[PDB]
Each structure stands twice: as structure tokens, then as C-alpha cells.
């Protein structure tokens, strides 16, 4: 039939998939009212909290037909609020997003008028995007404009965080009492920081009051609708909603149902406080819900079916919240409606032992049934994980819509401990976003933007000149024709890297200050370890752990490029640097013999070939060494991860031909995957190549693999997938995820998209509809190596 295990969830799912993407202007209006009332009369943290509270008090609330869990970010499903305190769109922005080819958002004429007349006049000079851009150096602006790197905080708040367990043990009235206790013990005689603590703690208290009002208003809304509903079954559902909201979020949840509603209210809260990267996620959902599940079934108020029904409702709620609209580079690097709410199922419990429980299997059943691209429902696989759980996950992956990805629990824990987390805290951790490792509920781990490693080699080969933007973007490391050795070339590359990282980090530091001062998040601070105890907002270092990342893109492309140069120019001496540079400038036109050599007669990453893989390691180590351990403004350090989202398309589009044989404006490699056509020795050879990268020293790496549908059939096919995951993870690989599609279906979908509106594929760290992808991205996915066992 229709997807959904029950008639209720079938109906909720059909509403969700039919909702049209559009913008909701109410949030911007209410924030404007609050600033006009309060700006200049209070410190900024209190201003944000008072503005959030004003928004919560006055926004319109809705309950959709059949819901058991309530709460929407916008006016209706697929309605995105706007965030003019971060990015106040131009009228052209609104025109572009309404009319663009993919990832469009409808802008009603009423929304356009209000934005033009009320929002722009107030927020255009206040938006943080202008504070950032106006503070960047000309070197940063040139590099940014040339596609050397991206900037995550230009249109969104740092975000990128995961809920802990606080909201299942405390309500917001409890947290407020904790905050009031902290306020009473501030020592203004001897603690010279007491004033800053008071401002942040006062804001947190106001945020708590706002959450109490959220629950109060939804309970009223539910009862007012109950008096008006004639259908007896619906009225009882409305009365159940009201009873649930009488408890949460003001008080700690007492039941499994209340635990889910508490999480979802907090989710609505933090993602309307600010437009945070990767929305929000409960993280280790099966660990938090299992005590409630066991208690509730034992008391006879819950069974497996109702527990599954509630989670199917939750799944639909995620799918009703798009990532708010992006423009410019932010869209190019994250070209999707999804908001990367990553759920980790399986793994280990807080004591460090096997965490698979009954809720874990329920989550696998609901993600299988619902087949929704939000949330991003993934599994943590431990050496302690039962093989039955892994094989069930492989069963779902083999169906070919991308979810779940697989994460190595032992790698995650060691990555966290390498970064300074205690073993006790690391056992609560996991991955969020695409593949990013973090200590859930206790860490600010902020991604700052992608770094175009292949184009750094391009700058090296052009003495700092960018052949595409036709500007001097890098530094003068020398004419490559004078390099007498591969070591000399690699040293020049490392100098270009150092310069580009220095440029990025300097801008990052400015941006970190701007976000801390102008984007404090008192609501998020209330639920993140150490903010209350420290009296310090999450956005300026209140978390127990603080890290920042620069995301490395294109390791396969640059590995094969430097490998091609070492092999052909310096070792075998089949041609010289001058000839290679002419070939690149001509996009290999007139140099077909060179193209054949570098493409087809040269070692390649992903074949368990140490000639290429040792170069991968050298590049990886240089990147790790250049970035890791640099201080952040708010008391943490920089670390390294490797993922592209859709930025590998953009980074290749503004790059010329590269020495490995990739042609001008083609995408660079995705994640740590091999280059196009690079791996010719099967999937075991590539996981052996990928394992030579030291995953433990990163905050996560992304590996895509693709299988022919015929080679994963039957029980042997499941075992082959399961065994590949185990083999990779036994070598301490971080992550792997699978495409399993018929190439001809994708090709047909390109010719007749309207017949394939349901076709979903794996992109990079998330799944999306094939029809939401540009032709270039579609062709990138189709070109990935079709593996056989």
C-alpha cells in the first residue's frame, strides 16, 4: 500500500511528502518587534532570549490532522522561517529562490511585501553576514570568491550539535532553578568575570520561561481544538496531546511518549532560536528511549506497535522541516532541502557495552517502512554489535536509497579520546551531520567551511596564480619548471597550503568573535554541558569541549595528481613539467598521449598500491599537521575532517584540468573515495587504501561505495556487505555508505524525470531525490565505480 505501518502514519506521511517548500515570514516579523522593543536596553544575550520568548509567546501554532507529536518550525509543513539577524535576503534573493531550477522555495506575495517593507529596512544593516564580509581581508575575499574555500557562518549559525540526556532527566523549570542557584552564588567581589556570567545566566533563565510557555500554549491549543472536534477518536488524541504538553517541556518527561515530545519541542526551540547547521538531533535516540520503553511496557501503557507508531510520527516531523533557504555559495556547498539531522542507532551504552536494544530494532523498522530522507537514520557498528543487527542494517542499505550509513564505534571513541574526551564522555558520543565525530550534549564542534585541496595544487603549479579567476590568489612559491625534484614540488605545495590555511583561520577567528557576541544562544546553552555551571553561553565556549574543523575536499583527486607528477615527470621521466603545464592549459587538447599516460598508465589511489597510497598519506599528514592544534578564540583547538557534501561539485567547477587527467571544470573526488575510474581492483582494495589514512586523528572521514545490484543478491550478498563493513572497521576505518542502483534507471530518470519522482540515491553523507540534483552531480554519482564482490 502506502508507506507507514498504521493508518495514522500513512496519512501523516502523505501530507509530508506533498507539502510544498515555501518561506514563512512570521518569525522575522516577531523578532523585528522584539528588537524595536528591547535593543539598546539590555545586553545581547538577554536581547536574544527576550526576542525568542516574544516569538514563542506570539507565533501561530498548528496541529496537523492525526498528529501525536506536535510542533512545526514554520506556519505549515515544509515552511521555512527566515533569519534576517544572520542573513537578511535581498529582493533578488527572494526572486532567485522562488524561481530557481532546484531547491526552490515559494515566496508568497504577502511574504515579499512584508520582507521588503518591514524586514529589510530594519535588518539589512544589522545582519551578521555584513559584519563578517566587511571584516574580511582582501586576501580572504579573493580566495573565497575564487573557490579556494567556503564559509559556513555567512548564512547560518554555527550549530552542528547534538542533544545529550539532560532533557530526559530535567524539565526547563528544573534548569531554571539550577540557573537561579548559580545566579545567587556569583561573587562580584572576587570573580572579575561575574558580570558576564550574570548576563548569560539571566538569558538562560528567560529561555527556560519561553519553553514553559511553548508547552502551555500547545496544551491550550489542543484543548480548544478538542472542544470543537466531533470525531471521538480525534478528540481523545487532542486530549492526549494536551496531557503530554501539561508535562513537557516544563517538567521532565515521565513516559516514552512524553520523552519524544520533549525532544521535539527542544528541536523546534533551538532551530528557531537560530538557523543552526544540521538542525538538531536526539543523537543516541535508542539509548535515551529504552528506559522509558521498558518502564512503559511493564506498566502496560505502551507496546511495540505504539512505540513504533510514535517514532513514525517523529520521522514525519523531521521530514516536515526543510533547511531554511540558501543562496550563493552556501547553496552550492549544501544543495539540498535536507538539514542533516543524524540519528545514531546501535553502538554502545553509557557503560561501554553493546547498546543494541529493542528500540534499536524499532528504529530500523520505522526507517525501513517510512523511506524518508529526513531524518538521516544511521547505525553505529561496534565489535560488540550482534551480527543480526548489522545484517538488518545491510538489508535496508541494499534496497538502494542510501540509508543507513555505517559508523565505526571503536573509531569514534578513539577519535574523541585523541581529542581529549574522557572515556566516560566518549561513550556518550557519535557522529552527526554527515560523518562528524562529537561528544553529544557536551561539545561545540563547529565546521567552518570546505578547503579546496586540489586547487591549492593548481595554485602551486601556477606560482600562486589562479588560471580560472585570472588573479593572484596564492603566494609565489616558484616556477614549477625549475623544481628539480618531487620533494621540491611537494614543499611548494605545503607552502601554498600553509598560506591558504592561515588566510582561512584568520577569517575564522574574526567570525568566531562575531558569532559569540551577536549570536549567543541562551536556549541551547541550557541543555549543553557545562554552560550553566560555567555561567557561559554555548556560543562563546560554555561547552565542556570545544573544537573547530576545516573540511578537506578532494584527497583522491590531489593524490592522483601528485602521484601522476612524481611517476611521469620525476621517476619515469616520460615528459617534463613544461609539457604537463601546457597540456593542462590546453585541457589536454593536442596532448592526448599525455592524457592517456596519466589516466591509464599511472598508479592510482584506491588500489592498495603503496606508490599512490604513500602520497595520499603524505598529503593527509600535511593537512592534519597544518590545521590541527591551532587555538580557537573560545579556548578549544582546530582539528581536521574529510567530507564534501555537494562542495566537490563546486570545487571542481572552478578548477582547471589537473595532472591526474581530470578535465577542466569537472568535479573533484568526493569524501576520501577514489577518483573517477581510479579504483580497478575491487572494493577490498579500496578499503585497504582508505585504512592507510589515520582516521583516529580526524573528526571523521566519508567513504562512498557502490555495488552492482546483482552482486548483493541473496543471503550471500548480505554477508558480503556485512563482511566489507567489518573488514574496513577492523582496520579502524571511520565510515562507509552504499549506493545500490541500476545505472539504466538513473539514465532513464535523466531523460524523463517525471516518471522517477520517487527515485532516491546516496550523495555524500545523506540521501536525496535524484531529481533534486544538478546534471553535473547526477553524472558524478553515475560515474562512481560499480563494485563487484
Author numbering: 1 to 789
Quoted from the paper:
Elucidating the activities of uncharacterized enzymes present in the human gut microbiome can enhance our understanding of this microbial community. trans-4-Hydroxy-L-proline (Hyp) dehydratase (HypD) is a newly discovered glycyl radical enzyme (GRE) that catalyzes the transformation of Hyp to (S)-Δ1-pyrroline-5-carboxylate (P5C) and water. All GREs use a glycine-centered radical cofactor for catalysis. In agreement with all characterized GREs, HypD is dimeric with each monomer consisting of two five-stranded half β-barrels, anti-parallel to one another and surrounded by α-helices. The Gly loop contains the conserved Gly residue (Gly765 in HypD) and is part of the C-terminal glycyl radical domain that is found in all GREs whereas the neighboring Cys loop contains the catalytic Cys434.
During model refinement, we observed electron density resembling glycerol in the active site. Although we believe that glycerol binding is an artifact (glycerol was used as a cryoprotectant), it is not surprising that glycerol is able to bind given HypD’s high sequence similarity to GD.
